[PDB]
Design an enzyme around this catalytic site. Structure first.
Site, short mmCIF file in Angstrom:
data_model
loop_
_atom_site.label_atom_id
_atom_site.label_comp_id
_atom_site.label_asym_id
_atom_site.label_seq_id
_atom_site.Cartn_x
_atom_site.Cartn_y
_atom_site.Cartn_z
N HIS A 1 100.76 36.14 -20.91
CA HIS A 1 101.57 37.19 -21.16
C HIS A 1 102.19 36.83 -23.01
O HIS A 1 102.87 37.82 -23.47
CB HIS A 1 103.00 37.32 -20.47
CG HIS A 1 103.75 35.94 -20.32
ND1 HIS A 1 104.07 35.54 -19.27
CD2 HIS A 1 104.26 35.30 -21.47
CE1 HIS A 1 104.80 34.35 -19.55
NE2 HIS A 1 104.91 34.29 -20.84
N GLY B 1 110.92 30.90 -24.77
CA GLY B 1 110.03 29.90 -25.73
C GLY B 1 109.47 28.81 -24.80
O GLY B 1 108.80 28.02 -25.19
N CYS C 1 107.82 29.53 -21.87
CA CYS C 1 106.48 29.66 -20.99
C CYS C 1 105.58 28.92 -21.42
O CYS C 1 105.29 28.50 -22.76
CB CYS C 1 106.23 31.19 -20.87
SG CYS C 1 107.54 32.24 -20.33
#
Ligand code: UGS
Ligand code: UGS
EC number: 3.4.19.12
Lengths: 304, 304
Positions: A41, A143, A145
């Site tokens: 993502h 921030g 992930c």
């Protein structure tokens, strides 16, 4: 003595954390050998998250569109691919801090340490467990992930989790290091309600054995039970069924204290039906299920 | 979102852990520059612990009697001295993994990460707090003395604690890195009962603010209180008195949620007098006091 939710030392993992940017999106990546692993993502803009077509999105991306930064030195991306929900960015440099490692897909009920990260920088370490509904109750912000879950077998890091999603209930979703999500979660900005989060019965028994080892013996009674009788009470309180294999796993704890597994099940049955009555066990006022019997044995022996 | 007892990444500290042996006693040491720091009880035999005369014991010890091992390489001891309750072993080699560091003596109520060790090997990391009675509720076994407590200010490790003792209640005692014990504890095998362990009120307020940030707002009521009225209820439940400085420290949390500090004190008063009624806050069934307001702000912002 003493009992704490202890995470593995994060040193080996810190040496693998990098920052991956794609467009205006920056997240964390796991740099092992000449590959950087990150949640796919990173390629989505906030609108793309609503209904993403990752293969179509990824067509518009070239190697030079992924910025990989290890500390303050920029890494050169010479290849990129998508494996399930993780992008693997082949870089021109092998991580000299790459430890001996394995990619494992852990079972629900198992524990692991998380090295929460922001901009490729480790900020904190804590212990988690894969819930029976395949969510984790972590601590993640924007921030974070790409933060990883892992165990250590002496000197070999077994990476088991990568953080990708926050769910409506506040729990988290992620994938193993091969990009497959644990559970039925998808990397799409859609409400994905989690299932019933059941209690990892064996972990509660292991933590009740740790409590006995520590000196907290108030909950021990003169009763016993059978696996079948215990499971009738466990089912009512959303507790995972107890099997003979769970009883066998508890072996070193049952031998260490001299208390039979079924005798401890009887104490657990009384804690379930009668509550704690304002009392505590290992400083907790509820039944803790995030210490597997391996964590308890390890902490109450001297393993490093 | 999500809220966890997060410890600082232990990497920088792992590179400083060594094994110190003296006679049949092996424990952990902190290798910084050309000095190895360790609890002075490494020189005692189990009988010596009963009533030790450290200066007399230390007279019979030479540099060659202290075995210092960093991993599997032996370090050469070229000087030894006693500073309060820590022995400082000057070695012929400076630790190339020495990070930027400071030795701090923390205040009671402050938190720190512990890197529990056995034979100079880090086994686990967890968060602790210095209790108002100067004990810590750690997790230590035999071989763990010399394990260190620390905080990290971006890249500077502030060592604050060294583990030396287990107390009758199961709590632990230790010293700052200058060898001075926190509290009235002495490194002697004598019963040293701890004082009343009071609740760090400000930490509970910070964790109740973290709970609001996370979505747990069941405990918020329509009432308010004053510092003086709150302290009348806090004193009864062995809670630390709340000052204007504590109210000011809670500033960023009070602003983030929009809830006044005194309004949150009123909710804490009702939790104290009425209990949790079987409910939980951040997955805990009791009032957590081991998150300072700095830990809460850090976790609910994005600091690394
Ligand atoms: C980069 O995109 C990410 C990263 C991390 N977590 C997400 N999570 C989601 O979108 C899922 C979600 C969560 C909560 C909701 C609450 C209400 C209505 C829908 C909701 C959907 C997306
Ligand atoms: C190397 O010597 C060490 C290391 C770590 N902890 C200790 N602790 C003690 O001796 C204090 C103690 C603890 C518990 C007791 C219980 C009953 C009667 C006396 C007791 C005294 C000594």
């Amino acid at each position: 003595s003493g009992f704490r939710k202890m995470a593995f030392p994060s040193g080996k993992v810190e040496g693998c954390m990098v920052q991956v940017t794609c467009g205006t999106t920056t997240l964390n990546g796991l740099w092992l050998d000449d590959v950087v692993y990150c949640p796919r993502h990173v390629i989505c803009t906030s609108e793309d998250m609503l209904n993403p077509n990752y293969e179509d999105l990824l067509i518009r991306k070239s190697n030079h569109n992924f910025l990989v930064q290890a500390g303050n030195v920029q890494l050169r991306v010479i290849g990129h691919s998508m494996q399930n929900c993780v992008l693997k960015l082949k870089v021109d440099t092998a991580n000299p801090k790459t430890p001996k490692y394995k990619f494992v897909r852990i079972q629900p009920g198992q524990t692991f340490s998380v090295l929460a990260c922001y901009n490729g920088s480790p900020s904190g370490v804590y212990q988690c467990a894969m819930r029976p509904n395949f969510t984790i109750k972590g601590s993640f912000l924007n921030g974070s992930c790409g933060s990883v879950g892992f165990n250590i077998d002496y000197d070999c890091v077994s990476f088991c989790y990568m953080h990708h999603m926050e769910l409506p209930t506040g729990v988290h979703a992620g994938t193993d290091l091969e990009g497959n999500f644990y559970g039925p979660f998808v990397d799409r900005q859609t409400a994905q309600a989690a299932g019933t989060d059941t209690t990892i019965t064996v972990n509660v028994l292991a933590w009740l054995y740790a409590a006995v080892i520590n000196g907290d013996r108030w909950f021990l009674n003169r009763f016993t039970t059978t696996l079948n009788d215990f499971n009738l009470v466990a089912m009512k309180y959303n507790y995972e069924p107890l099997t003979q294999d769970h009883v066998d796993i508890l072996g070193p704890l049952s031998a260490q204290t001299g208390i039979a597994v079924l005798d401890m099940c009887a104490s657990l049955k009384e804690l379930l039906q009668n509550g704690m009555n304002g009392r505590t066990i290992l400083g907790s006022a509820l039944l803790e299920d995030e210490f597997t019997p391996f964590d308890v044995v390890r902490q109450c022996s001297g393993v490093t």
